[PDB]
């Protein structure tokens, strides 16, 4: 790695608010290559949104952001910016900057998540998904935790402090109509192990400084 | 505008040619994997980007631009995008993503149902979860029944990314009711229909027994 694009300034904002993203470039001069912003809503495709030639000053915006976003650059700090005003729910996405390479974008930043919501930051409630007592001695049982009513993304879930990894599925979060997120994490284990091994999900919500361990035990 | 990627199933070793769906001057192609930045494959219609494998190629014919992967390997299963450049608004546009997934033998899901916890019920809500574990193909139908009344509009689904080791999917469906509504009924059932099941499988519990 010699050329690099490093973004920052993302995170949380309310509808009507404003954020400023930065794109710090190294290994090349911003006055030698044009730079773009591209965004991606969760589970959706890539959307090109703005362009700037730092040397000429020429700027262009997608109609989806025209009049609301301003792209600019400071050649002395070798950094490009995206000023985003009048933000809406639908502007929620990972924002990337990227460099022109003939007809193509060669280098891309790591992405910064922007979440536009009226929700305040809130830790999850964690509830056990208790294994079926009608399992029973064999063969395979399932158990899990429901991680509910948190904002914003992300949450991490581990099992038995990372000692249990085989058979774990932590599902993508869904945004509920409350504007809060919810996900489940599940694991399959031998049914014979339900009476003989403790299972604990370790849920970490870094944005709220919340960490919950929940013991998940049979019905019985 | 924009939207979810479309899907293409292929076996390791298969040959794949994607066509980029106002005529364009040039096109670029990208590969993207979950939680990662897009990666440039082909620029200016047909130029292989430095370090991209030679099994990736791009070509123009008339007004139609294609990307061909001559023989797929595991690391090529990902979402692909064409980028159109044109001398007219909008001048740069990414097409709908094409998610190339691994074709695997059909595998029926293992199904598990979970009642709401007593602690959740204290807070005035009941969430009932139905798990479909390690199945293929991705397409499955989950139908909730409460006292044999078929439900709609009170559940949400979520599906995992295709498993890196066994190429299956897993799916959660959560049925959400008020505590009051949950307590008005007895039998909670999740009915699953899938290509690997000769008839639907139902998992159920009765409130107060589990």
């Amino acid at each position: 790695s010699e050329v690099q694009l490093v973004e920052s300034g993302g995170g949380l904002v309310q509808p009507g608010g404003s954020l400023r993203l930065s794109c710090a470039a190294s290994g090349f001069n911003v006055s030698s290559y044009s730079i773009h912003w591209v965004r991606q809503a969760p589970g959706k495709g890539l959307e090109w949104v703005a362009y700037i030639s730092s040397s000429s000053g020429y700027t262009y915006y997608a109609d989806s952001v025209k009049g609301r976003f301003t792209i600019s650059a400071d050649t002395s700090k070798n950094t490009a910016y995206l000023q985003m005003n009048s933000l809406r729910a639908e502007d929620t996405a990972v924002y990337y900057c990227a460099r022109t390479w003939y007809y193509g974008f060669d280098y891309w930043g790591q992405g910064t998540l922007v979440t536009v919501s009226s929700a305040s930051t809130k830790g999850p409630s964690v509830f056990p998904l208790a294994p079926s007592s009608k399992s029973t001695s064999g063969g395979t049982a399932a158990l899990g935790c429901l991680v509910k009513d948190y904002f914003p993304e992300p949450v991490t879930v581990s099992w038995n402090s990372g000692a249990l990894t085989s058979g774990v599925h932590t599902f993508p979060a869904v945004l509920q109509s409350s504007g809060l997120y919810s996900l489940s994490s599940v694991v399959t284990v031998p049914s014979s192990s339900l009476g003989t091994q403790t299972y604990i999900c370790n849920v970490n919500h870094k944005p709220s400084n919340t960490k919950v361990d929940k013991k998940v035990e049979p019905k019985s | 505008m924009t939207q979810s990627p479309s899907s293409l199933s292929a076996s390791v070793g298969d040959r794949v040619t994607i066509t980029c769906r106002s005529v364009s001057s040039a096109v670029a192609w990208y590969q993207q994997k979950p939680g990662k930045a897009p990666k440039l494959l082909i620029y200016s219609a047909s130029s292989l980007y430095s370090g991209v494998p030679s099994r990736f190629s791009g070509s123009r014919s008339g007004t139609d631009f294609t990307l061909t992967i001559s023989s797929l390997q595991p690391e090529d299963f990902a979402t692909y995008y064409c980028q159109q450049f044109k001398r007219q608004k909008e001048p740069i546009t990414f097409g709908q993503g094409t998610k190339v997934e691994i074709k695997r033998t059909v595998a029926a899901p293992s199904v598990f149902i979970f009642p709401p916890s007593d602690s959740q019920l204290k807070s005035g809500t009941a969430s009932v979860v139905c798990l479909l574990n390690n199945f293929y193909p991705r397409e499955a139908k989950v139908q909730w029944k409460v006292d044999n009344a078929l439900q709609s509009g009170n559940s949400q689904e979520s599906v995992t990314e295709q498993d890196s080791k066994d190429s299956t999917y897993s799916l959660s469906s959560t049925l959400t009711l008020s505590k009051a509504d949950y307590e008005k009924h007895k039998v909670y059932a999740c009915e699953v229909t899938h290509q690997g099941l000769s008839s639907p499988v139902t998992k159920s519990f009765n409130r107060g027994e589990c």
């Binding site: 030698s32 290559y33 044009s34 362009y51 030639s53 000429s56 020429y58 262009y60 022109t100 390479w101 003939y102 007809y103 | 001057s25 040039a26 200016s44 450049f85 001398r87 007219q88 608004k89 001048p91």
Partner: peptide, 16 residues
Amino acid sequence: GSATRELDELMASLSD
């Protein structure tokens, strides 16, 4: 340099 020229000229030439 020449890597940025084609797209930059494309963008500068736009009228609609």
